[PDB]
Amino acid sequence: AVNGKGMNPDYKAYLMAPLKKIPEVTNWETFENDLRWAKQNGFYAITVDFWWGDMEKNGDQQFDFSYAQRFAQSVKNAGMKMIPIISTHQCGGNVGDDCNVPIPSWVWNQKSDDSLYFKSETGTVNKETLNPLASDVIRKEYGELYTAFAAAMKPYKDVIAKIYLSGGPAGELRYPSYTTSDGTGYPSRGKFQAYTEFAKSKFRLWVLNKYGSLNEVNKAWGTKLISELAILPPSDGEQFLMNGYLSMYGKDYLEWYQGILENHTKLIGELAHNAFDTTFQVPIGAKIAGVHWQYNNPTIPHGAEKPAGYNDYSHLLDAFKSAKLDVTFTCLEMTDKGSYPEYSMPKTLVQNIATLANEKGIVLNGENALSIGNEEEYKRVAEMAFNYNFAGFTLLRYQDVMYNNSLMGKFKDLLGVTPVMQTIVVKNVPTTIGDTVYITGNRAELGSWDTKQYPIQLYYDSHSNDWRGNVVLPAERNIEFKAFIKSKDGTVKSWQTIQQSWNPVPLKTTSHTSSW
Ligand SMILES: OC[C@H]1O[C@H](O[C@H]2[C@H](O)[C@@H](O)[C@@H](O)O[C@@H]2CO)[C@H](O)[C@@H](O)[C@@H]1O
Ligand SMILES: OC[C@H]1O[C@H](O[C@H]2[C@H](O)[C@@H](O)[C@H](O)O[C@@H]2CO)[C@H](O)[C@@H](O)[C@@H]1O
Numbered sequence: 201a202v203n204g205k206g207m208n209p210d211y212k213a214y215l216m217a218p219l220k221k222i223p224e225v226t227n228w229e230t231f232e233n234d235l236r237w238a239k240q241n242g243f244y245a246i247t248v249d250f251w252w253g254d255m256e257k258n259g260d261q262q263f264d265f266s267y268a269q270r271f272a273q274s275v276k277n278a279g280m281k282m283i284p285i286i287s288t289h290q291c292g293g294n295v296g297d298d299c300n301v302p303i304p305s306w307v308w309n310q311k312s313d314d315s316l317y318f319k320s321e322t323g324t325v326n327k328e329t330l331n332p333l334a335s336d337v338i339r340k341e342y343g344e345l346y347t348a349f350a351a352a353m354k355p356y357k358d359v360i361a362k363i364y365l366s367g368g369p370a371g372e373l374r375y376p377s378y379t380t381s382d383g384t385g386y387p388s389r390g391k392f393q394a395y396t397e398f399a400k401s402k403f404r405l406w407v408l409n410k411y412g413s414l415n416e417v418n419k420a421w422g423t424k425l426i427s428e429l430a431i432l433p434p435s436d437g438e439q440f441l442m443n444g445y446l447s448m449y450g451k452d453y454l455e456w457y458q459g460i461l462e463n464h465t466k467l468i469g470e471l472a473h474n475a476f477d478t479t480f481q482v483p484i485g486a487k488i489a490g491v492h493w494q495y496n497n498p499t500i501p502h503g504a505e506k507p508a509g510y511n512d513y514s515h516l517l518d519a520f521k522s523a524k525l526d527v528t529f530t531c532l533e534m535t536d537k538g539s540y541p542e543y544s545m546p547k548t549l550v551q552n553i554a555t556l557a558n559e560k561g562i563v564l565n566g567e568n569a570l571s572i573g574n575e576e577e578y579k580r581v582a583e584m585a586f587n588y589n590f591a592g593f594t595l596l597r598y599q600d601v602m603y604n605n606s607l608m609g610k611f612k613d614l615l616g617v618t619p620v621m622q623t624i625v626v627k628n629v630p631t632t633i634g635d636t637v638y639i640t641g642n643r644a645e646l647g648s649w650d651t652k653q654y655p656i657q658l659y660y661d662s663h664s665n666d667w668r669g670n671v672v673l674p675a676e677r678n679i680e681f682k683a684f685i686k687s688k689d690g691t692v693k694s695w696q697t698i699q700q701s702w703n704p705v706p707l708k709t710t711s712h713t714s715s716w
């Protein structure tokens with residue numbers, strides 16, 4: 201892996217449940233046998249959406265957790281763990297959805313203004329999730345929903361391994377900038393979502409707070425604004441993404457726009473730790489979307505990320521580290537393209553988010569964006585997950601492997617791995633001053649025969665005069681590897697004589713000793 205180290209010793213594989221309730225798919229008895237089958241293939245737990253439109257449908261404070269308790273009891277019976285997602289967003293309208301659960305109808309009647317929904321550059325209204333700017337309705341409703349849930353699922357705490365929060369559309373912290381009705385679906389540019397009367401007022405008040413008066417606004421932006429009513433979001437998003445973003449106005453508008461998602465992250469992470477920390481004592485996390493199209497478009501750079509709310513990823517992850525939330529990036533199986541008309545760059549994007557997260561000390565988990573129907577994509581998820589320190593990988597979705605034993609078998613071999621620490625020892629190495637010994641091998645957890653970015657560093661033992669190191673390996677998988685010398689200046693001076701193997705790696709800690 202990256203920086204001379206190996207795979208994360210805490211790695212676990214997870215399975216996403218159907219979007220529909222288990223009784224609308226099969227019966228609870230073959231569901232319990234499918235979870236026993238899943239666990240024999242390396243899965244640790246199942247993640248499942250518990251929808252808001254189902255848990256508090258009839259009215260405020262009129263709760264129904266009967267489906268969540270019945271699902272938890274069958275997980276108990278099958279001997280597995282679950283990871284609930286408190287889904288405060290709509291099921292239906294996004295990629296892969298085959299369900300239709302709106303959020304409770306009555307939440308929209310709590311206000312007379314337009315503070316609760318979104319409106320785009322061209323007037324399209326969106327009501328998939330609550331507008332994070334209405335933080336008073338969010339503190340009240342999410343607060344009540346998280347505490348009623350902890351009291352009802354308190355019996356099943358031993359079956360709960362983690363808890364996920366929904367930060368916006370499709371369960372991700374972002375704005376609804378890519379949707380069919382707005383004309384902004386893939387691979388098109390996104391539209392900004394700050395055109396409600398309430399969002400315009402809120403942008404206007406933050407600017408006047410930052411500067412003081414219209415006078416100081418014109419001096420900082422270098423503008424000639426006439427009245428305070430002229431402080432608006434962009435009237436043209438395309439022109440704004442072509443070059444308005446470089447001005448001082450541009451930088452202040454994107455700081456306020458992304459700033460609203462950073463403050464929502466701190467509010468929901470605070471409501472979640474209060475409600476759950478005593479009762480469950482599990483990690484809590486949230487998800488960030490992989491908006492990889494229009495990334496390197498020359499005319500409109502980062503043309504789809506910026507309307508979705510992503511302008512500076514380092515400042516976005518900082519909100520996650522201070523709210524005490526783990527992060528999940530949802531796009532590992534794709535490769536880079538970068539050509540017209542999509543200008544897509546998913547792997548560069550995943551490498552950049554992973555580097556930032558590992559720098560800041562944030563636990564990182566991954567997911568595939570679309571159904572995998574081929575072993576080649578499992579090898580690409582494996583390369584990213586084991587070389588960029590991911591602590592978990594969740595597979596979208598249930599039916600893809602549960603009804604395909606050949607794909608399920610390929611997943612077990614490549615990704616349903618249990619990490620175990622082992623000691624590798626290499627004797628008789630002709631090392632000279634400044635040289636360093638590394639090991640690389642055939643599987644992704646050994647760097648896939650790569651000698652520049654991914655080899656695992658070993659350490660000289662001056663007492664027995666050999667090179668060694670405790671390495672995390674995939675238990676009971678066959679591996680091939682070779683040690684090599686790297687000079688003081690990063691060049692491969694020489695390789696080990698014979699290729700070595702461990703057929704397979706034992707699952708109890710031992711040592712593999714070899715000679716140059
Ligand atoms: O929230 C929905 C989802 O959108 C993106 O998925 C893309 C996919 O990557 C493209 O190949 C294409 O099929 O359009 C999809 C939907 O717009 C993101 O990759 C994903 O993370 C995001 O959550
Ligand atoms: O079950 C979890 C969520 O699954 C879907 O959203 C996925 C989407 O399918 C995928 O392309 C993207 O990369 O990630 C999201 C979030 O995991 C549903 O659309 C969501 O409603 C579900 O919560």
Ligand SMILES: OC[C@H]1O[C@H](O[C@H]2[C@H](O)[C@@H](O)[C@H](O)O[C@@H]2CO)[C@H](O)[C@@H](O)[C@@H]1O
Binds near residue numbers: 434435436439445447
């Ligand atoms: O609030 C001031 C004005 O902001 C926007 O105009 C921006 C424009 O979006 C940007 O691309 C350009 O380069 O700079 C101007 C700021 O002078 C709104 O479009 C205007 O209606 C606002 O008055």
Ligand SMILES: OC[C@H]1O[C@H](O[C@H]2[C@H](O)[C@@H](O)[C@H](O)O[C@@H]2CO)[C@H](O)[C@@H](O)[C@@H]1O
Binds near residue numbers: 649682695699
């Ligand atoms: O690059 C893929 C191959 O890496 C190793 O091969 C080394 C070989 O061990 C060494 O003696 C020779 O001098 O260089 C090659 C690398 O170019 C593995 O031993 C092979 O199995 C891999 O295919």
Ligand SMILES: [Ca+2]
Binds near residue numbers: 260261340341344345
């Ligand atoms: Ca309520």
